[PDB]
């Protein structure tokens, strides 16, 4: 058929459309440098941004309001967001009841439901069940990190290789395992030697010896010396 790229697995990031938006609504509102009181991280479904049980409570621990955050988060998130999407909202409140909320990409824990066709608890940890959900392989785990960036001021920094180990951790901290791990042999691909792909990709390791010391080499040269 047709492979999407003749550089296989290079695909540095998503298409240049959603990313302009991925930098747009995930833009970090800069601090007014004030003195915080409490950092909060709530769990709001982006559609119905409503005063939840704790969200309205903790906000009202202070004589503050609950809806002003909601609607200014609701209407800000009326377009540009899909339906039935839940979001982590990191709120930074200051001493003078001043607050500036961020909007965080939906992380891995409740993400697998859209990745392994499962639900909470059925992904019980190694102490609970012993089995786990549908398998993963060493590209299905690379793509999920492309959506998680603590660094939006630096999209490619740090490159995927350092944080990709994280997402595959909690999913394995929840017991779900990858074919590239826990196993005896790797993925069988009938488009070629099912066995020699191990020795066929050992050089695919090398084109990234030149790149690993080049992706991070442009990091420190994008900074002061």
């Amino acid at each position: 058929p047709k492979t999407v790229n003749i550089e296989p697995g290079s695909n540095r990031f998503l298409d240049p459309n959603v990313e302009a938006k991925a930098k747009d609504i995930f833009a970090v509102p800069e601090f007014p440098n004030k003195a915080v009181l409490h950092n909060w991280r709530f769990f709001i479904k982006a559609g119905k941004a409503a005063t939840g049980p704790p969200v309205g409570q903790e906000f009202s621990k202070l004589g503050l309001k609950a809806m002003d955050f909601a609607k200014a988060f609701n209407d800000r998130t009326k377009p540009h967001f899909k339906d039935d999407i839940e979001l982590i909202v990191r709120i930074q409140v200051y001493f003078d009841k001043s607050y500036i909320f961020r909007i965080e990409p939906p992380p891995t824990a409740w993400f697998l439901l859209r990745a392994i066709r499962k639900k909470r608890g059925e992904t019980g940890p190694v102490v609970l069940r012993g089995n786990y959900c549908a398998y993963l392989t060493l590209e299905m785990c690379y793509e999920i990190a492309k959506m998680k960036q603590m660094s939006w001021g630096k999209v490619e920094y740090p490159p995927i290789e350092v944080r990709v180990r994280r997402v595959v951790g909690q999913a394995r901290r929840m017991g779900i395992a990858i074919i590239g791990i826990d196993t005896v042999h790797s993925s069988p691909v009938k488009g070629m030697t099912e066995k020699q792909y191990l020795e066929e990709s050992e050089k695919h390791r090398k084109v990234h010896m030149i790149q690993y010391e080049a992706l991070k080499a442009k990091e420190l040269e994008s900074a002061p010396l």
Partner: protein, 162 residues
Amino acid sequence: LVLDNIEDPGVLGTLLRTASGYQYDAIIATNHCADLYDHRVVRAARGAHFQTSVPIYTLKDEDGDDVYGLLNHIVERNNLLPLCYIAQADAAGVDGETAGTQTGFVSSPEAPVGRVFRSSVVGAAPVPLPAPRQSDSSYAASLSRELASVSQAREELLSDFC
């Protein structure tokens, strides 16, 4: 108006005047909710309880939901849409009761039970009311009073087209 719970006095007397003070026809008192002729419930409405424009429709029934056949006994269908007053999983009163264009029905329960069990089993439109927090709620006489005053005549909403 309707008051469907095992209610108490005189949190209806102050409510069986909003039917009068805002010109309702009569009131389905879902007895045995509480006392209805009591010397306090009538006194809690300052004599305006026994007003000319409010004959006390004291209703004896149960959770059989045959009361919706009584809702059908009450001036037929094509008059009384759902009426329920529930917690805040529901939209609004300036969402549902902003979109009448038609005729419906009013009903105000008490806190400990809500309504009889088979009251929410037949309904396309219950009514919520805003609240300070989630588990916090408001009165039984403060339920209808916001809604007996939105379904009073609805003359502003006409001017509220835009």
